[PDB]
């Protein structure tokens, strides 16, 4: 009866979906062939409820990039995916200068090419990540306009993703991207109770007050089963 399965290494060594980047030809949001994505792990529920078990966490990540058309088909189209550290230039178009990647890391991958993996170290200026930050990172008087700043840890903003179709012209194919994360070399501190309520937002743990759900399943009488 070995305890290896219950270790935090094997529990976080699974890979899961952090975000989905969509880049269509026709539409509203990204029609130009480039998509900027701010880094957040809170987008999807399953991977979030594992990380919210603990408070502080120190880990290295391995990302996998799955590119396909929204119907599943694959076409020979070339793509560039770069990492913009905090404070760098963000490209305003696909022909801009920010794509010269003279510093920022970039990746050249095709659609028929097997997915791309990269190892990302622990770059936080603190000793560990904290998803729960109680306080106001600003100073001075705190009004209701800046109240949105509650629970915002400046140490957890690691950059912005960027991806484009490689070329001057526009490609007829609409691409969608599914990014995955595998937590490895993980350390943990201060466990917390898991969240029984449905998620609402990314940045703060708001729960619907009328939707409050009893954790256990109700029954008729406590003397019967």
């Amino acid at each position, epitope marked *: 009866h070995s305890t290896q399965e219950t270790a935090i290494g094997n529990f976080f060594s699974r890979a899961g979906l952090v975000s989905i980047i969509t880049m269509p030809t*026709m*539409g*509203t*949001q990204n*029609t130009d062939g480039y998509a900027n994505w701010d880094i957040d792990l809170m987008g999807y529920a399953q991977l979030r409820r594992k990380c919210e078990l603990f408070t502080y966490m120190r880990f290295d990540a391995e990302f996998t990039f799955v590119v396909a058309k929204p119907n599943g088909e694959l076409v020979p189209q070339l793509l560039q995916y770069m990492y913009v550290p905090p404070g760098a230039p963000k490209p305003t178009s696909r022909d801009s200068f920010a794509w010269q990647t003279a510093t920022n890391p970039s990746v050249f991958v095709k659609m028929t090419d097997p997915p791309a993996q990269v190892s990302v170290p622990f770059m936080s200026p603190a000793s560990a990540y904290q998803w729960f930050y109680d306080g106001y990172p600003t100073f001075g008087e705190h009004l209701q306009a800046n109240d949105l700043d509650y629970g915002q840890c400046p140490n957890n903003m690691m950059g912005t993703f960027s991806i484009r179709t490689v070329g001057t*012209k526009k490609s*007829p194919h609409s691409i969608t991207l599914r990014v995955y994360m595998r937590i490895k070399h993980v350390r943990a501190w201060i466990p917390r109770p898991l969240r029984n309520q449905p998620y609402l937002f990314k940045t703060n743990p708001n729960y619907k007050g009328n939707d409050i759900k009893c954790t256990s399943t109700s029954r008729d009488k406590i003397t019967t089963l």
Partner: antibody
Amino acid sequence: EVQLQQSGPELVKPGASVKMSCKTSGYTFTENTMHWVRQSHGKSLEWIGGIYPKNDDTKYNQKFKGKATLTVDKSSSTACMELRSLTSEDSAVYYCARGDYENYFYAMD
Amino acid sequence: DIQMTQSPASLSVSVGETVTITCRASENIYSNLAWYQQKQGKSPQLLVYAATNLADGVPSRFSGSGSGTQYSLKINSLQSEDFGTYYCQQFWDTPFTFGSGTKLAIK
């Protein structure tokens, strides 16, 4: 079935600002994009920029990006554009026309 | 930025003849064409979109066709209310660009 009414002709000295208004009806205002088009002499046309009236979504022409802004009031239905630092060659008739559902393409009807 | 040029600039034709106007793009859009009719002192009106399908309220005398870059618009048979300038548009890349215009007079 769909009517778009604009403001009246306006005259201003160079250097000041101007704000137009475009009011529509006959359809759900939040589900259709709107564009602005300028007609200079004689037949020449240009594309100012679009707007998506849910919260805000904006696309400007790279030439007109600095000389024009786009705002939309979602309560009372209107579309207003504002121009900064007018000059002699900026005088033209301006059009506002509805786009396609959830799309900037599918040219204005 | 894709540019488009129409030919001819001014086409004079009497009533009852076929008229073919063209629109050419620098890049191959394949999906996007819009022909407009602007009368004198009036707002533009859409005629044929997607290079083929005619819009609502447009008579059946207008048949557009084309593929790739070069496109065309054929009018048969011309009537007396169809005089005016014509334009062509691309949906493909921002900015949306318009042609130079083609004036249609009576011979």
